[PDB]
Structure 1
Amino acid sequence: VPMHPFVKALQEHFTAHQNPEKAEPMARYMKNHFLFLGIQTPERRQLLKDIIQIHTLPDQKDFQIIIRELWDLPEREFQAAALDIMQKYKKHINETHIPFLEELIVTKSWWDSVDSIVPTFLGDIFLKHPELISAYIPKWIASDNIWLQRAAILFQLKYKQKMDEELLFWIIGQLHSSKEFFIQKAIGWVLREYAKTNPDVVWEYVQNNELAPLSKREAIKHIKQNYGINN
């Protein structure tokens, strides 16, 4: 069965505008886990737009198929484009897509893809269906996969006043001993971000609970100005 024509067209059009000179530092930035064509986001967005203008966005029946086929291509720009395309199908994504999103998180995994899946797509789903959080988050924390663990930490990133504080701090407690940079840093990020909404609660938490040095430092990067640094 041939590649979906929309995906074939995108592959052809991206490849015709590849930049091997830029591809080398772009690949180094992601610690050489992926090949790159060398196309940065503004042009990549336009090249996708070109193909949508010519071919139209595929019928929603093929949405998951398109994403998978792009996910399976070697160069990282195709996963970046896949996430752009998923946003165009946003209104069609719901709680039944959580396993599909899980599988994107644990394949071709790195911070660039995972951070574009978790606080937005999964965040929105669990905001609407908070009763489903306990069907997934305990498994993610217990798994060997650091990107599912990072997903558990960051899905509430943008919740602001809708943050479930007890849940957030419980998740962080489960993962606070991790020696993995991407877990320590995710903990720092979500605390720093939530501190923009509720600085008193984050300050109390970090002064009175164990965290990796990196996590605490990142958490209070801004709010330490509000409370001061004791001698």
Structure 2
Amino acid sequence: PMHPFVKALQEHFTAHQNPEKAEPMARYMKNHFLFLGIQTPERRQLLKDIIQIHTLPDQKDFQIIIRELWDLPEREFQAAALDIMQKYKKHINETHIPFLEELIVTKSWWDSVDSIVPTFLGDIFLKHPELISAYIPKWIASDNIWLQRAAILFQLKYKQKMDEELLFWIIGQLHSSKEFFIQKAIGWVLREYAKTNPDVVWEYVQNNELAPLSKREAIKHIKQNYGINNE
């Protein structure tokens, strides 16, 4: 924590650490991260305390503060970094895509990636759909499952603005993956989009290959709409 705002946050969080809670919290993330043991409601209040005392740093320091928090060992600091990014939301634009990519592929797990993709990247590609093809093909072709998950989930909240052809093309590229985080993301995005257009999702899952997990997750609700044919 070079930056004084980050140092203040580190000190304040550490003073309220809970080693008893940190153990199960770390186990929940498969022990990929150390935890201080601070859950979301308190963690947000502790951040708020520091903002009240120091004020939110000038936007010139935004990316710097995020990266410094990203570099700290305990997972709460990445969660706090994401809370802070939201506070700078109106300053984030298409020029930040590489910055967001780097966040996705460092300290990677489902918690951070899910908090970056459908919101920050989703909003950017909604305003600049013409940039999708500058990134999505690379993400799918990469060795990185989190970039692949990003390609699937960036349209999660699009509803009626969903690009169906694009969605199904992306899923087609990834449908053979044996990776849980890919199979489940496919299930999730289809389940969610089915809330907007159930007929299109139903037809897709009945007529295109998917991992068993992806298909069952996709239709967990809409199977009530159409029924389950006797085998």
Which residues of structure 1 form unaligned runs of 5+?
none
Separation in 2, partners of 1:36, 1:23:
5
Match of 1:185 in 2: 184
TM-score by length of 2: 0.99
1:71-117 Cα shifts (integer Å, max 9, x gaps): 00000000000000000000000000000000000000000000000
Identical counterparts, % of pairs: 100
Quote the offset at 1:70 in angstroms.
0.0
Give runs of ≥4 in structure 1 deviating > 6 Å: none
1:138-160 Cα shifts (integer Å, max 9, x gaps): 00000000000000000000000
Separation in 1, partners of 2:226, 2:138:
37
Which residues of structure 2 form unaligned runs of 5+?
none
Separation in 2, partners of 1:109, 1:221:
28
Separation in 1, partners of 2:116, 2:2:
24
Separation in 2, partners of 1:125, 1:20:
38
Give the secondary structure class of the aligned counterpart of 2:220.
coil
1:135-189 Cα shifts (integer Å, max 9, x gaps): 0000000000000000000000000000000000000000000000000000000
Quote the offset at 1:215 in angstroms.
0.1
Separation in 2, partners of 1:203, 1:216:
10
Give the secondary structure class of the aligned counterpart of 1:183.
helix
Match of 2:69 in 1: 70
Separation in 2, partners of 1:148, 1:125:
16
Match of 2:56 in 1: 57
- Equivalent positions of 1:98-177 (< 5 A) are 98-177=97-176
Quote the offset at 1:3 in angstroms.
0.6
TM-score by length of 1: 0.99
Q: How many residues align?
A: 230
Give the secondary structure class of the aligned counterpart of 2:171.
helix
1:25-83 Cα shifts (integer Å, max 9, x gaps): 00000000000000000000000000000000000000000000000000000000000
The two structures, once aligned, show a CA RMSD in angstroms of: 0.4
